Amino acid sequence: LSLNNLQNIIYNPVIPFVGTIPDQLDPGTLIVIRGHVPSDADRFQVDLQNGSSVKPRADVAFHFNPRFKRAGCIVCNTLINEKWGREEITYDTPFKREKSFEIVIMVLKDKFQVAVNGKHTLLYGHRIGPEKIDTLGIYGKVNIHSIGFSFS
Numbered sequence: 656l657s658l659n660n661l662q663n664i665i666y667n668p669v670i671p672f673v674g675t676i677p678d679q680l681d682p683g684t685l686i687v688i689r690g691h692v693p694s695d696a697d698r699f700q701v702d703l704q705n706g707s708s709v710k711p712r713a714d715v716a717f718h719f720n721p722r723f724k725r726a727g728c729i730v731c732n733t734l735i736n737e738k739w740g741r742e743e744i745t746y747d748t749p750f751k752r753e754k755s756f757e758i759v760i761m762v763l764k765d766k767f768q769v770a771v772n773g774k775h776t777l778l779y780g781h782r783i784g785p786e787k788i789d790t791l792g793i794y795g796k797v798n799i800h801s802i803g804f805s806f807s
Contacts, residue, residue, distance in 0.1 A: 656770075658687055658759065661803035668802060672793040673707050678806045680785045682764045690799040691755040698722045699795030701758070703788045712737045713790065716783035717767055719760070721750040733782040745777045755800070 663677045678684070680703070692699060703717040715734035722728050729745045749771045750756060759770045766780045793799055 656773075658685075658805065660805055660807050661687060662806065664801060664803040666801050668793070668799050670793055670795070670797060670799060672791070672799065672802070673704075674791050674802070676789055676791055677804060680762045680788050682762055682785075684762050685805040686760045686791065687801075687803045687805070688758040688760075688793070688799065689755065689801045690758075690797055692721075692723065692750070692752055692797050694752050696752060696796035697724055699797035700793070701760075702792035702794070703760075704790035704792050705783070705787045707790050707792075714783060714787070715792075716781070716785065716788050717760070717779060719758075719769065719779075721748060723750065723752055727751075729777065731777065731779045735783065740782065743777075743779060749774065749776060 688701060698720060700718060700720040702715045705714040705716065707713055712734065718732045718734065720730040722730060727748045727750060729748050731743045733740045756771050761768045762785050766778050768778055769776045791802065
């Protein structure tokens, strides 16, 4: 599906990345993240955050965490009031070490949908109102090639 009109593009960002999202994540908006993990990576994470506070720890509406140990998985969760919720684990994962990915996170009314390299990966229902997200965090052993946004 369509990745047209990507704006505010950043190439080769330094990791850890913590950036202000340039507009509100309304239903229909998307975030596109391209990258790969190196051969010594076990995991990395993308977080859609309310702010960038370290203490107290900023709330994370959507934590998306591929883990590469043996057959692999993706863990999704939410952090509210400095506490992690109950994780949702997806075992059918497209991620592999040294294999590049295009992650598309699309905000829908009731959930996020995530696709990788043009194929559906998972769904994650909203636990925090998406209007409260203003910060993108990327952490861990990951080489990010680019970040872009679609708001139009």
